[PDB]
Amino acid sequence: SHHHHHHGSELPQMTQQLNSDDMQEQLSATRKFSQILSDGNEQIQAVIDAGALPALVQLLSSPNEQILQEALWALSNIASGGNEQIQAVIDAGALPALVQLLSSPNEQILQEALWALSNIASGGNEQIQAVIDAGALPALVQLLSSPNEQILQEALWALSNIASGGNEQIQAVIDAGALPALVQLLSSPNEQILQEALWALSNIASGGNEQKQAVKEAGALEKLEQLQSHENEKIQKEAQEALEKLQ
């Protein structure tokens, strides 16, 4: 969803001061920007300081759709910041509830839960490990065989981020039975899915010998070879990289 900044915004003239030659104007504008950024982070931190996270995690068990969905947006949002903010989400016990919400008959709830997991798995290796431990992988994989393309795309993005951890985190993806589904996804009519399936296999390929062979066993060499000649240009530029590192 795109927005317009309000008409009374001071930001444009503030940006002009930064680019100016005056150096009183330069100093004034950097101070105002530092204030805006400090204020914005502090409002986010105050919510965490307030003890909101564990109470929001509780509300993930709400029978009410409205409440569960808003509490889910809030957590996803926090988990989209730095590592420290993901840690707070994890510490509040979000993961088991987030993993459980992958069984939700609601397609809107499933997608928001998948986006939350992606955010958390975009952090450090031990935080991706936490996700793995919570048993996210068995559900993520079965969700790769989904008729719903929009769900598939987010489940795929969540695996890629897990697949961008250490070798042991990558191996957990392999052990979960992810490759057959990923390789099949290189036959996707939808181009955007192909590219994320590509980037997922590319992230796995950044592992050691064991991870590479597993990808060769799944039949990914054959595909990337006779895929390096697809209609699109950047789908060839990324399949060339996904084939070259497997060396």
What is the contact surface with its own copies in residues (CB under 8 A)? 3, 5, 9, 11-12, 14-15, 18-19, 23, 26-27, 30-31, 33-34, 36-44, 46-47, 49-52, 55-56, 58-59, 62, 64, 66-67, 70-71, 73-74, 77-78, 80-84, 119, 122, 124-125, 164, 166-168, 206-209
Closer Cβ to its own copies, 142 or 167, answer by number? 167
In 3D space, the residue among 111, 210, 128 whose CA is nearest the CA of residue 163 turns out to be 128
Closer Cβ to its own copies, 149 or 210, answer by number? 210
Torsion angle (degrees, nearest 10) of CA 28, 34, 35, 39: 170
Separation CA 156–CA 143 (nearest Å):
9
Tell me the residue nearest to Mg ion as measured from the CB. 212
Instruction: Look at the chain and count its residues.
Output: 247
Binding mask 199-228 for Mg ion (x = CB under 5 A): ----------x--x----------------
Binding at 212: pick from its own copies, Mg ion, none (beta carbon under 5-8 Å per type): Mg ion
Binding at 19: pick from Mg ion, its own copies, none (beta carbon under 5-8 Å per type): its own copies
Is 230 a residue that touches Mg ion (CB under 5 A)? no
Separation CA 57–CA 165 (nearest Å):
25
Closer Cβ to its own copies, 32 or 230, answer by number? 32
Give backbone dihedrals phi and psi of 208, rounded to 5 degrees, phi first. -80, -165
Separation CA 145–CA 193 (nearest Å):
13
Separation CA 166–CA 213 (nearest Å):
16
Size of the site for Mg ion (CB under 5 A): 4
In 3D space, the residue among 240, 241, 218, 217 whose CA is nearest the CA of residue 227 turns out to be 240
Helices (DSSP H) in 63-176: which residue ranges?
65-78, 83-91, 94-100, 107-120, 125-133, 136-142, 149-162, 167-175
Binding at 147: pick from its own copies, Mg ion, none (beta carbon under 5-8 Å per type): none
Closer Cβ to its own copies, 88 or 139, answer by number? 88
Binding mask 5-34 for Mg ion (x = CB under 5 A): -----------------------------x
Residues near Mg ion (CB under 5 A) are 34, 38, 209, 212
